[PDB]
Design a protein around this ligand. Structure first.
Ligand SMILES: C[C@H]1CCCC[C@@H]1Oc1cccc(-c2nc3cc(C(N)=[NH2+])c(F)cc3[nH]2)c1[O-]
Ligand SMILES: [Ca+2]
Ligand SMILES: [Cl-]
Length: 223
């Protein structure tokens, strides 16, 4: 997160860290046994780390659970990043409490101007690499489709939306990939891609989760 602030320990209880010996992507807990992340964060040997704040210190509240299976969306296109969503099933259910909680899936899509919370342990520099120990937060609005398509002509599909600041300075970045974009208590986006981080007129692009609720529910119900 570039230009964001320290969230405060456990204030984002649905945030998870996907770990393979180091933090590589974020994700969102949607029930006690499933996490939603981005398809491009897929890899084998994933350990999901819940209740985290400092990812380099065991401070208490952490639950480390291995992924039993990862389900990348069948129509995921790694060249356009269209359908960039993945579901991860945990080997055992997590114990939910006030520090580890699931976030709700939306019943409708959000409108331009909605203010959302984006969080993660991704890079904090737009020019260079500085990865934080604790969770960073950024409040950012969903942009209109016209401004998004004007920024990324020919690359935005109906399963994506832009959120951020066209002036640059505040944005999600590499490492935040797979994590949550929550608006009015509902998970509306997944950090997916963007050109650089916090650059002027190059906002972040997020997977539009409201277009995948029936898919998430049918897939969870059959696995
Ligand atoms: C291929 C996976 C393997 C595990 C590590 C993440 C990597 O994926 C990535 C590699 C390099 C950059 C990104 C990335 N940059 C990003 C920048 C932005 C933004 N400008 N708001 C964003 F929204 C998502 C991004 N994701 C990214 O998601
Ligand atoms: Ca920790
Ligand atoms: Cl276009």
């Amino acid at each position: 997160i570039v230009g964001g602030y320290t969230c405060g320990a456990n204030t984002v209880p649905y945030q998870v860290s996907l770990n393979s010996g180091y933090h590589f992507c974020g994700g969102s807990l949607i029930n006690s046994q499933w996490v939603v992340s981005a398809a491009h964060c897929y890899k084998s040997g994933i350990q999901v780390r819940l209740g985290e704040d400092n990812i380099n210190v065991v401070e208490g509240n952490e639950q480390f659970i291995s992924a039993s299976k990862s389900i990348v969306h069948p129509s995921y296109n790694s060249n356009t990043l269209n359908n960039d969503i993945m579901l991860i099933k945990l080997k055992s259910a997590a114990s939910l409490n006030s520090r580890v909680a699931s976030i709700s899936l939306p019943t409708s899509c959000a409108s331009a101007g909605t203010q959302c919370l984006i969080s993660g342990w991704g890079n904090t520099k737009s020019s260079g690499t500085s990865y934080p120990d604790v969770l960073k937060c950024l409040k950012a609005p969903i942009l209109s489709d016209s401004s998004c398509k004007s920024a990324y002509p020919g690359q935005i599909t109906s399963n994506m939306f832009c959120a951020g600041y066209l002036e640059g300075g505040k944005d999600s970045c590499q490492g935040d990939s797979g994590g949550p974009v929550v608006c009015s208590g509902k998970l509306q986006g997944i950090v997916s891609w963007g050109s650089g981080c916090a650059q002027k007129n190059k906002p972040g692009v997020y997977t539009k989760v409201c277009n995948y609720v029936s898919w998430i529910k049918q897939t969870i119900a059959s696995n």
